[PDB]
Amino acid sequence: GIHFGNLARVRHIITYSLSPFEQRAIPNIFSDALPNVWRRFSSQVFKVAPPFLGAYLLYSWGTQEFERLKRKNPADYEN
Amino acid sequence: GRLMDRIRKWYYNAAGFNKYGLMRDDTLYEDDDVKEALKRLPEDLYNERMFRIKRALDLSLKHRILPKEQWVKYEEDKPYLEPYLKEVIRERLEREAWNKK
Amino acid sequence: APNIRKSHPLLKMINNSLIDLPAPSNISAWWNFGSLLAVCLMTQILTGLLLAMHYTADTSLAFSSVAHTCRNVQYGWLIRNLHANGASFFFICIFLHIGRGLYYGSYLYKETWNTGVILLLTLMATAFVGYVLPWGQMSFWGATVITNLFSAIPYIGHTLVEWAWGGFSVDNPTLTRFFALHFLLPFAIAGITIIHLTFLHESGSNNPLGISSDSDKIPFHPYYSFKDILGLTLMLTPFLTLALFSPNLLGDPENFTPANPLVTPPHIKPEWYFLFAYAILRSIPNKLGGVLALAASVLILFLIPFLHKSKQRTMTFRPLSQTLFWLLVANLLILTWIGSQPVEHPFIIIGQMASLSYFTILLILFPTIGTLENKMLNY
Amino acid sequence: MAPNIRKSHPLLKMINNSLIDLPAPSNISAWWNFGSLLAVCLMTQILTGLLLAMHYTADTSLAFSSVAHTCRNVQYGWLIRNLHANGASFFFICIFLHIGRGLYYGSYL
Amino acid sequence: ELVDPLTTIREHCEQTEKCVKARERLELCDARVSSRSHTEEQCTEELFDFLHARDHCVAHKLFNKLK
Amino acid sequence: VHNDVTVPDFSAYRREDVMDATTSSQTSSEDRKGFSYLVTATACVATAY
Amino acid sequence: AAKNVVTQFISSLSASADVLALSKIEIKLSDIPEGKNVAFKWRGKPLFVRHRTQAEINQEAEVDVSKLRDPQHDLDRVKKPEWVILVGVCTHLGCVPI
Amino acid sequence: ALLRQAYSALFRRTSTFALTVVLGAVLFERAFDQGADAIFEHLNEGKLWKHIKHKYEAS
Amino acid sequence: GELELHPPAFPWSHGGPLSALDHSSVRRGFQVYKQVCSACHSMDYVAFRNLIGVTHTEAEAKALAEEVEVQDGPDENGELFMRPGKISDYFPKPYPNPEAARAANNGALPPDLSYIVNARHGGEDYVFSLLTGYCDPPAGVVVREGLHYNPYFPGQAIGMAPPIYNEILEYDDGTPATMSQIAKDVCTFLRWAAEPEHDQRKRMGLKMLLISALLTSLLYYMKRHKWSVLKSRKMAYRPPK
Ligand code: HEC
Ligand code: HEM
Ligand code: HEM
Ligand code: HEM
Ligand SMILES: C/C=C(C)/C=C/C=C/[C@H](OC)[C@@H](C)[C@@H](OC)[C@@H](C)CCc1oc2c(O)c(OC)cc(OC)c2c(=O)c1C
């Protein structure tokens, strides 16, 4: 059952942390937060958007095309 | 030729594992062969790989990456495990061929 | 001794899986669905029992009993809504859960993944029979179609249909056995979910980076208990907004018409969470092929593990794989769209493409690009 | 590593851990057989029960007759209903003796 | 005696740009179909395009006049 | 040697009332704790509702 | 013992005895004017009875009977060329054909 | 200092904290429920049977 | 044919997520259903008691109830028999079975309106457009004898004749009984009929959103708080020299 203590062998790593009460829950909302939100957004939009944007069109086309084929062709009764 | 040689440098930057401070070898998935390799690693190399990883995990939880100035450069990437891994797999293949023999 | 949190035969378990459970320090929101899925199961079961208390498994009474539940039973309408919409958020969540798994190579945890597939499949069957209970036009004809799928099996087949209906046509014997079946399955789901988490705990959660997190684990509590609660509340808003403001949004209005054994509505479409598969099956203009395609469209999940060629575990560092991935997601989004459209041009051909597309990205492109990417890493 | 797959496998490790390698006193008597019978009763009831629930109808106006139909029209419905009805009894017969044994041999400790 | 605001506004709306052209397109169809004997065409489409444009307009203010 | 180890600077994160390294953080403690616990208490009240 | 208990239980699922087996149904060919199809409840699922105008009767007897999934000639299917009678149930997965 | 007083007198002791949540909900409930309805009924004046009522009532 | 006219979107006073039903108009619609539609349409899931406190006073409802003779029994001799209506009874079925109804409507079967707006895409927008959208067939379109033209109805040849026209009744509240006014009231009624919870459903939604906001917020703060320990966590690799 118990896993904490076996996990892995680690040496020479020091860490420093502060009580949740000595710091801010959401700090540097502008100087740090948002800037990264953008960073991340930026770096993934060209990977994600393409296939979706693509399908999007396929939708509109297929939709419009199906609808076009609804309308009547006057050339069928000009006789 | 020097085609995939620059292709490689491109991919290396595209992959992006260096923005975390990891070497190509750090990101290797730990199957049997790799775990065996990791075992043979001299201590310094092993302790270093650990820290690199632990730092990357901290970066991930933080949703941050290293400053562009600390990203590993394609040509400075050390394949510290690659060779060990080769041997390990080499060693295994032999046993295998031998046992079917 | 010392503490009764680690010694007690029972608490030792709650503590062993929801308090001292070591978890990667970096798992993201895409790891919140596991519990949401769990919460859905609980929520469904609970509202379900509540509803089952006022239901009547009988063709001549089913439809109206549900009506009475909504119109006469205090908050009956609310409960039915939460149950109807819960079903959807169950699928929404399960779908994202599956996605995350594919993107981050969680499927490398074979037993956890496989049982996961069983869960999806069971959830599917569960939701099916359940939908047949209000006994509206959709309920009836859906029942008719889905059970009929098995007629595709050589020799036997039909004989299996007889069982499914308890007759030679959908009728009361079917309704009552379906109510039983629907009452039962949720629990087989909860049960299997225990096996799921059990196999999972053998290895512990995987993480975005797809590399060992032993160098940095954290107690589930309070890190993920807190994260999870937050996650729940986020999923809760849309679910309730939908439930309280646009109740029938995700539902077909054709099912407000009591089942008519003699008339299949001109416009009959599968519940949204079935559309993608529905679409794939319509593509093959052959009975057996379409079924096999349908079967394959879901069963293929079992192969994913044997199609992993990447030397890396996740797609975090595989830009090509990442695109192929999102392509697949849109591919499905397309198949879903198609499912809602009539069997006509250009829809038919588009569907067939998407279908052909789907199996290809999974059986061929992915393993291929993975191999390709390995070489690009000079491996 | 673990040699046999009977003691290592996450699931078998359990069937083996409680129904195969489970250490048991060499002298437990017949009064120790009810635990499993009880378990078998539970299983049998659930099973025959599901089978009956497939033909029941929870409605004052139909309940009595649905059961009659189960017995009169459903193949072996009569048998299933009987097994379910009498199973209930053997369930109590067994549970009562189980309780007895416990009291006599101080299992309540 | 009374006047259904529905008619009042249906008129006003038929004055509208689209309606007019739609109405016209329709009249044209009706004409040739009503004449040409032993034909095969219909004027559903035009009637709909007309209706669609008309009522869309109707449904935009009709309620203001209703209680 | 362990003498060459310093705890980094946490001003970018410290709460305004414990930013000055020469002021007893204790006086502002009751508030720092009172506030966070208030959020929690409130959440409890909401959920309770 | 096992084979028999499974047998019995397995068959508790099959159709019950109250599942009859009923007769015919008469239909006045006058209620069905030419050029129309009408559905009648029967043995459970629908039942079609369609009065075919010879405008159709031709087409149905004039098609590649070799290019048919289930090859048959409109003639050996019905009896009176102005009437076509079949069970209104799609052979695919059972819906009612419109 | 509310935060200090609050902490010092409500949030510190696990008991007083609990009682405060109970007490809280109570007051919060009344307040919320009333105001919520107020907001709803306002946004829907003269449309509720509450509003129409008197026309077919007593005197 | 393979072409259909979808209805427009009228601004029903209850269309909005926080917009209740106009009970006055619902009261009206009732009358329309009672005095006009009920002659061929059953509303099996509603009872006179349902009106109480919604559109009518208890007395009014009881009254409306008694106006109908209901069949009860058996009695002492095992005889059926009539009796006045109780607020517990449901709205009277115009026919004892579809066969009879169809018989009295050219074989056409008027559907039960209890859940009508939800049984049709478009709901009141569709029901409304249909009731008023009656008109003559376009060129080339022949409407079979018995059926009437209505572009909004699928197939355009419906079996129901225009049920309403100006002053087909007189709203005892003084509202001008214009045809569309009527359609607007009965449609509003058909919405309430299909979902009385409608109003409460929405009032809850309001409370829901408020709490959901307050709570999602407080929990975002809480999640962050605890996690800060990790977010700001700094580490370093100080190997031995
Ligand atoms: C003389 C009987 C009669 C009256 C009175 C009448 N209807 Fe109907 N109604 C019918 C018939 C017949 C149909 C079936 C038409 C069909 O499906 O071919 C019908 C159908 C309908 C339908 C739509 C069916 C569909 O498929 O779209 C609605 C909605 C409807 N009526 C509403 C009303 C309302 C509201 C009123 C009162 C304002 C009303 N009717 C009054 C006979 C009537
Ligand atoms: C009732 C259905 C299901 C429930 C309630 C459920 C629940 C869970 C839970 C609680 C977790 C842990 C947290 C997380 O990572 O999300 C988990 C993990 C996992 N589940 Fe599921 N699951 C279900 C179905 C499935 C399905 C359909 C699949 C895929 C075919 C699956 C595959 C996995 C895998 C691979 C993991 C590993 C997560 C990781 O990468 O660390 N699950 N599941
Ligand atoms: C796996 C979890 C569950 C899922 C996915 C689920 C899904 C569904 C679905 C889709 C329907 C039709 C909803 C509709 O009316 O549109 C339904 C109906 C129903 N379910 Fe479930 N259900 C679940 C659990 C349960 C359980 C455990 C019970 C009770 C023992 C239950 C009782 C009912 C009842 C009474 C109905 C029929 C009446 C109604 O439609 O509300 N369900 N369920
Ligand atoms: C704890 C195990 C169970 C016990 C002790 C038990 C006991 C009983 C008893 C004493 C009756 C009345 C029998 C009679 O007709 O004389 C009964 C009836 C019934 N039980 Fe159970 N039962 C069990 C499990 C189940 C389950 C799990 C189901 C199905 C989900 C089920 C379904 C029914 C049905 C349909 C009836 C009513 C019709 C009948 O009497 O045969 N039972 N059960
Ligand atoms: C007694 C219990 C039984 C027999 C259980 C059977 C379980 C089967 C499968 O679950 C594993 C099945 C639900 C799953 O197939 C993988 C679905 C994706 C199939 C989806 C599906 O839905 C339809 C539907 O909903 C309809 O009505 C609104 C109508 C339909 O066509 C006219 C369909 C349909 O054509 C398909 C393919």
Side-chain angles (χ1 to χ4, degrees):
Chain A
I2 44 180
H3 286 292
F4 262 126
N6 312 305
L7 300 171
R9 185 193 186 66
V10 172
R11 303 191 65 199
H12 314 127
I13 303 185
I14 309 183
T15 59
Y16 318 78
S17 300
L18 297 188
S19 168
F21 300 110
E22 299 290 306
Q23 46 173 152
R24 276 171 283 139
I26 315 168
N28 326 306
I29 345 68
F30 305 90
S31 49
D32 187 38
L34 307 187
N36 287 284
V37 189
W38 179 248
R39 187 194 86 252
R40 300 207 273 145
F41 177 167
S42 309
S43 58
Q44 279 301 99
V45 74
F46 278 100
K47 301 188 176 190
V48 174
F52 282 159
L53 157 67
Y56 172 79
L57 305 179
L58 178 51
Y59 169 57
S60 317
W61 174 73
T63 298
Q64 294 158 56
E65 171 60 353
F66 172 74
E67 274 305 299
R68 186 184 78 70
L69 300 175
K70 288 286 190 59
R71 315 296 299 186
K72 71 176 170 196
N73 176 42
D76 297 295
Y77 323 105
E78 297 196 302
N79 300 281
Chain B
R2 178 193 168 187
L3 165 55
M4 38 273 263
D5 199 301
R6 55 180 182 178
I7 272 178
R8 281 189 172 72
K9 189 176 174 77
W10 167 73
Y11 188 69
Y12 181 100
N13 293 288
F17 50 80
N18 57 311
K19 297 183 181 46
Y20 282 107
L22 312 177
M23 317 294 267
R24 187 196 52 170
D25 287 22
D26 295 338
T27 68
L28 274 181
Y29 164 57
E30 294 184 45
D31 60 30
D32 296 332
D33 289 333
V34 175
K35 294 203 200 86
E36 173 55 15
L38 287 159
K39 284 179 182 171
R40 318 197 178 184
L41 274 185
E43 187 162 32
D44 47 26
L45 288 194
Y46 181 74
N47 299 315
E48 271 142 41
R49 182 192 112 100
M50 190 92 276
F51 179 69
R52 282 202 289 293
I53 284 175
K54 189 196 178 70
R55 194 232 282 108
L57 290 165
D58 176 85
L59 277 179
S60 194
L61 89 71
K62 280 162 159 61
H63 287 297
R64 300 307 142 83
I65 67 169
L66 297 176
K68 159 229 59 193
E69 315 90 68
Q70 320 192 207
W71 302 2
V72 180
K73 301 168 199 154
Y74 173 61
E75 40 282 310
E76 307 186 316
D77 191 297
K78 321 297 182 182
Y80 66 71
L81 188 66
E82 166 107 291
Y84 289 104
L85 179 39
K86 292 192 181 188
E87 182 60 0
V88 156
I89 302 174
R90 207 181 68 101
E91 279 174 334
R92 196 198 75 216
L93 290 186
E94 170 184 47
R95 294 188 297 257
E96 280 178 27
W98 195 293
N99 302 300
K100 309 182 181 186
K101 232 237 181 183
Chain C
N3 41 39
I4 311 306
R5 184 216 302 157
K6 307 161 191 163
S7 57
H8 186 305
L10 297 196
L11 301 194
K12 164 179 292 185
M13 293 189 73
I14 289 61
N15 167 70
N16 238 47
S17 51
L18 280 180
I19 299 184
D20 294 358
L21 179 49
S25 67
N26 64 308
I27 45 180
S28 52
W30 299 105
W31 260 264
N32 288 58
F33 296 104
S35 51
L36 293 177
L37 272 176
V39 179
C40 279
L41 189 51
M42 297 323 306
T43 301
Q44 281 302 86
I45 292 180
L46 172 31
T47 57
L49 285 166
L50 277 174
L51 291 188
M53 311 205 130
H54 304 90
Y55 183 67
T56 295
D58 192 72
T59 51
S60 75
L61 293 173
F63 190 92
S64 37
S65 67
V66 190
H68 157 280
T69 291
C70 300
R71 298 161 163 295
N72 300 304
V73 186
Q74 305 257 296
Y75 294 106
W77 62 272
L78 173 55
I79 296 175
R80 196 288 188 65
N81 288 190
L82 297 159
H83 198 67
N85 289 94
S88 285
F89 279 72
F90 207 136
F91 281 82
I92 293 174
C93 286
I94 203 185
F95 285 145
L96 299 174
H97 188 70
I98 301 187
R100 172 293 288 289
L102 179 59
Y103 191 88
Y104 299 100
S106 306
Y107 51 86
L108 281 187
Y109 288 162
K110 288 198 173 62
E111 295 100 322
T112 307
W113 181 261
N114 293 323
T115 63
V117 192
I118 302 300
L119 279 153
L120 176 66
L121 281 177
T122 301
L123 170 48
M124 282 199 196
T126 302
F128 157 50
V129 298
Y131 185 52
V132 183
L133 301 189
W135 210 241
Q137 270 295 57
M138 292 314 216
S139 299
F140 189 86
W141 295 105
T144 308
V145 178
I146 293 175
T147 45
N148 250 148
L149 288 171
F150 300 81
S151 58
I153 304 177
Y155 300 140
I156 56 167
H158 276 273
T159 301
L160 276 145
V161 175
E162 170 185 54
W163 288 354
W165 298 339
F168 289 164
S169 76
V170 170
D171 205 332
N172 214 67
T174 321
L175 181 46
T176 58
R177 64 187 65 193
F178 271 32
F179 174 55
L181 209 29
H182 185 67
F183 197 124
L184 185 63
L185 296 176
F187 303 90
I189 286 174
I192 299 174
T193 296
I194 299 303
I195 301 188
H196 192 60
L197 297 180
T198 281
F199 277 121
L200 174 71
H201 290 156
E202 281 286 294
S203 56
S205 301
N206 170 197
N207 77 72
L209 298 189
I211 47 171
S212 204
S213 45
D214 301 351
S215 46
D216 200 14
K217 296 275 188 176
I218 41 176
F220 177 92
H221 181 66
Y223 291 133
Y224 299 103
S225 37
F226 265 91
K227 196 179 181 186
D228 285 1
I229 305 304
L230 170 60
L232 179 75
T233 66
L234 296 181
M235 179 209 143
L236 237 29
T237 304
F239 172 44
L240 298 194
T241 297
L242 198 51
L244 287 164
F245 291 114
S246 178
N248 318 294
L249 195 65
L250 313 181
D252 195 309
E254 184 72 68
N255 214 47
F256 274 84
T257 299
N260 176 333
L262 305 175
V263 195
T264 301
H267 294 144
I268 176 178
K269 289 304 177 300
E271 308 81 277
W272 73 258
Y273 44 75
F274 283 175
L275 293 174
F276 80 91
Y278 171 58
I280 300 193
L281 175 156
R282 276 198 312 198
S283 292
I284 299 64
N286 160 298
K287 189 172 182 172
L288 183 51
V291 174
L292 295 157
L294 175 43
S297 72
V298 172
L299 283 190
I300 189 175
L301 284 187
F302 281 123
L303 292 194
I304 301 296
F306 312 103
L307 288 199
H308 186 91
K309 297 298 187 169
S310 178
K311 280 247 172 299
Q312 304 193 296
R313 184 170 201 193
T314 67
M315 294 168 169
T316 305
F317 306 141
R318 287 188 290 157
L320 310 183
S321 295
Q322 288 176 41
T323 286
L324 195 50
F325 174 82
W326 291 112
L327 211 66
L328 179 71
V329 179
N331 186 335
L332 294 163
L333 187 53
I334 287 175
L335 283 158
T336 294
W337 164 52
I338 291 292
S340 73
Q341 304 304 172
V343 188
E344 300 182 51
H345 180 68
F347 293 150
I348 293 163
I349 179 60
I350 306 183
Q352 302 174 285
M353 290 293 86
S355 292
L356 189 49
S357 170
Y358 175 79
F359 290 95
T360 302
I361 308 175
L362 290 173
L363 300 181
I364 304 163
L365 304 204
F366 267 125
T368 301
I369 299 307
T371 285
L372 177 55
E373 264 163 342
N374 285 334
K375 296 188 184 304
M376 289 175 70
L377 279 180
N378 203 48
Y379 274 138
Chain D
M1 293 306 91
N4 41 40
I5 311 306
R6 184 217 302 158
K7 308 163 193 161
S8 58
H9 187 305
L11 298 196
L12 300 196
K13 165 181 292 184
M14 292 189 72
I15 290 61
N16 165 71
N17 237 48
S18 52
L19 277 183
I20 300 182
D21 293 356
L22 179 49
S26 66
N27 64 313
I28 50 183
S29 56
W31 298 109
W32 261 265
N33 286 59
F34 298 105
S36 56
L37 296 176
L38 272 177
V40 179
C41 280
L42 189 51
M43 299 324 308
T44 303
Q45 282 302 85
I46 291 174
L47 174 31
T48 56
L50 287 166
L51 276 174
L52 293 188
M54 311 201 133
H55 303 91
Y56 182 70
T57 293
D59 192 71
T60 53
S61 77
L62 293 174
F64 188 93
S65 39
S66 70
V67 189
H69 156 279
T70 291
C71 300
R72 294 163 168 296
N73 300 308
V74 188
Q75 307 255 296
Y76 294 110
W78 63 272
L79 172 57
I80 294 178
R81 197 285 186 69
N82 290 190
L83 295 160
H84 197 65
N86 289 91
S89 288
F90 278 74
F91 205 140
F92 283 80
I93 292 171
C94 288
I95 202 177
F96 286 145
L97 300 172
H98 188 69
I99 299 184
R101 171 293 288 289
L103 182 59
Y104 191 87
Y105 299 101
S107 305
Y108 49 86
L109 285 191
Chain E
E1 182 199 67
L2 76 173
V3 188
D4 191 4
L6 174 65
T7 51
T8 282
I9 304 185
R10 280 194 189 176
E11 303 186 312
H12 154 61
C13 280
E14 283 164 291
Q15 253 64 293
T16 288
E17 174 67 77
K18 296 195 183 64
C19 296
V20 181
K21 302 311 160 195
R23 162 61 75 175
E24 172 186 353
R25 292 187 50 274
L26 179 57
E27 306 291 59
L28 285 168
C29 183
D30 193 66
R32 69 166 178 291
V33 191
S34 307
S35 51
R36 175 54 171 301
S37 296
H38 214 61
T39 183
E40 190 62 300
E41 180 180 354
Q42 308 176 307
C43 303
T44 299
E45 171 168 344
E46 302 73 16
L47 172 43
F48 282 173
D49 305 327
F50 174 59
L51 284 172
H52 189 296
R54 196 194 81 201
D55 296 305
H56 172 314
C57 173
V58 181
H60 241 293
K61 40 221 169 204
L62 161 53
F63 275 24
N64 290 286
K65 296 185 177 183
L66 299 177
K67 196 174 172 185
Chain F
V1 300
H2 86 284
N3 304 260
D4 310 339
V5 169
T6 346
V7 177
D9 190 334
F10 285 113
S11 284
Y13 310 105
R14 276 168 178 278
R15 300 193 170 197
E16 176 206 72
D17 281 354
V18 295
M19 194 82 71
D20 180 25
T22 64
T23 320
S24 182
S25 74
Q26 300 305 337
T27 62
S28 72
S29 71
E30 310 232 311
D31 305 80
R32 295 182 286 108
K33 277 176 293 193
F35 178 74
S36 284
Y37 284 150
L38 172 68
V39 178
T40 302
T42 302
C44 288
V45 186
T47 330
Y49 176 80
Chain G
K3 177 286 186 57
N4 272 267
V5 167
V6 175
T7 277
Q8 305 164 178
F9 286 9
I10 227 114
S11 74
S12 82
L13 296 170
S14 307
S16 38
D18 61 296
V19 169
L20 5 144
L22 309 190
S23 61
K24 305 172 184 176
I25 165 187
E26 297 189 62
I27 306 171
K28 183 176 180 176
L29 297 163
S30 297
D31 326 304
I32 315 175
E34 194 182 68
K36 181 187 178 184
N37 165 68
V38 183
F40 299 64
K41 178 68 176 297
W42 186 48
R43 303 187 171 189
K45 298 292 189 174
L47 162 60
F48 296 146
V49 184
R50 179 174 181 169
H51 191 173
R52 291 179 289 186
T53 78
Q54 189 134 299
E56 312 170 304
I57 303 174
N58 304 315
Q59 296 176 294
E60 299 302 303
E62 287 189 53
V63 188
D64 267 297
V65 185
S66 60
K67 298 184 179 184
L68 290 187
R69 200 163 312 196
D70 190 18
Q72 269 172 45
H73 198 295
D74 170 43
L75 304 175
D76 39 60
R77 277 183 64 67
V78 291
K79 287 181 180 178
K80 278 207 170 186
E82 49 272 340
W83 305 102
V84 61
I85 297 175
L86 15 74
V87 185
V89 190
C90 182
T91 61
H92 184 213
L93 293 172
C95 298
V96 183
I98 299 177
Chain H
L2 295 173
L3 293 167
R4 291 185 60 280
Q5 298 178 67
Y7 171 81
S8 182
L10 316 176
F11 311 150
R12 185 142 170 296
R13 276 218 65 204
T14 302
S15 62
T16 57
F17 181 95
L19 296 228
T20 298
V21 172
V22 170
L23 203 317
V26 171
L27 320 187
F28 171 81
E29 198 189 20
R30 257 188 285 84
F32 188 77
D33 284 311
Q34 303 197 334
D37 293 308
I39 304 184
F40 189 71
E41 310 198 14
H42 171 277
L43 304 174
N44 281 288
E45 278 299 335
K47 298 163 65 176
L48 305 179
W49 173 262
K50 190 173 187 169
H51 308 154
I52 303 300
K53 180 191 164 177
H54 66 56
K55 303 178 185 177
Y56 328 78
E57 287 294 305
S59 53
Chain I
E2 188 203 66
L3 35 164
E4 54 185 356
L5 172 70
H6 300 170
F10 306 63
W12 310 90
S13 65
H14 58 260
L18 283 187
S19 316
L21 282 169
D22 176 11
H23 292 210
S24 337
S25 182
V26 177
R27 184 184 174 75
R28 251 194 293 297
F30 170 60
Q31 200 183 306
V32 177
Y33 170 70
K34 174 194 180 71
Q35 301 176 183
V36 179
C37 324
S38 69
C40 315
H41 290 300
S42 61
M43 181 133 91
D44 301 331
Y45 300 91
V46 190
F48 301 76
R49 62 185 165 73
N50 290 307
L51 295 163
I52 303 179
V54 172
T55 56
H56 306 62
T57 61
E58 164 158 45
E60 287 179 343
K62 186 190 172 186
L64 279 162
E66 302 166 316
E67 283 183 47
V68 197
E69 280 277 287
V70 192
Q71 182 178 75
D72 216 11
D75 53 35
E76 304 79 63
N77 334 308
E79 289 293 12
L80 284 175
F81 67 93
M82 294 317 118
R83 71 179 178 70
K86 303 182 174 180
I87 66 187
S88 54
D89 305 322
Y90 283 69
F91 297 160
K93 313 168 95 80
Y95 317 93
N97 55 70
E99 287 72 24
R102 281 182 179 297
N105 284 284
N106 294 309
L109 168 55
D112 167 280
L113 302 175
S114 305
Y115 290 100
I116 198 52
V117 301
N118 292 341
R120 296 290 188 298
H121 280 95
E124 48 265 61
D125 280 347
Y126 164 81
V127 173
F128 185 83
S129 300
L130 179 79
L131 291 185
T132 68
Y134 278 104
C135 77
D136 289 338
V141 171
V142 293
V143 178
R144 181 186 72 67
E145 184 197 61
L147 307 186
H148 305 48
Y149 192 79
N150 194 302
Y152 285 110
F153 179 89
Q156 297 76 49
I158 193 171
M160 177 181 50
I164 54 178
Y165 48 67
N166 290 300
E167 310 164 299
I168 187 174
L169 87 178
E170 301 195 319
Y171 290 141
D172 48 56
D173 80 315
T175 301
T178 43
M179 184 211 251
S180 71
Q181 169 61 33
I182 287 177
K184 180 268 188 178
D185 294 311
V186 71
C187 273
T188 291
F189 175 71
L190 296 187
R191 161 55 46 181
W192 168 87
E195 51 168 275
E197 72 266 30
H198 175 283
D199 280 19
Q200 178 178 49
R201 173 162 68 68
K202 288 187 178 174
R203 192 185 303 240
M204 284 193 185
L206 178 63
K207 290 185 176 167
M208 183 278 281
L209 290 184
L210 286 181
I211 294 294
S212 181
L214 169 52
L215 196 55
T216 298
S217 298
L218 300 171
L219 289 186
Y220 186 68
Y221 174 80
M222 287 181 75
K223 185 283 188 177
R224 296 284 283 185
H225 184 68
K226 292 288 186 155
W227 278 80
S228 63
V229 183
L230 274 159
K231 284 290 183 169
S232 55
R233 181 185 62 168
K234 288 179 165 47
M235 63 193 243
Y237 178 52
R238 294 201 69 243
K241 204 47 273 180

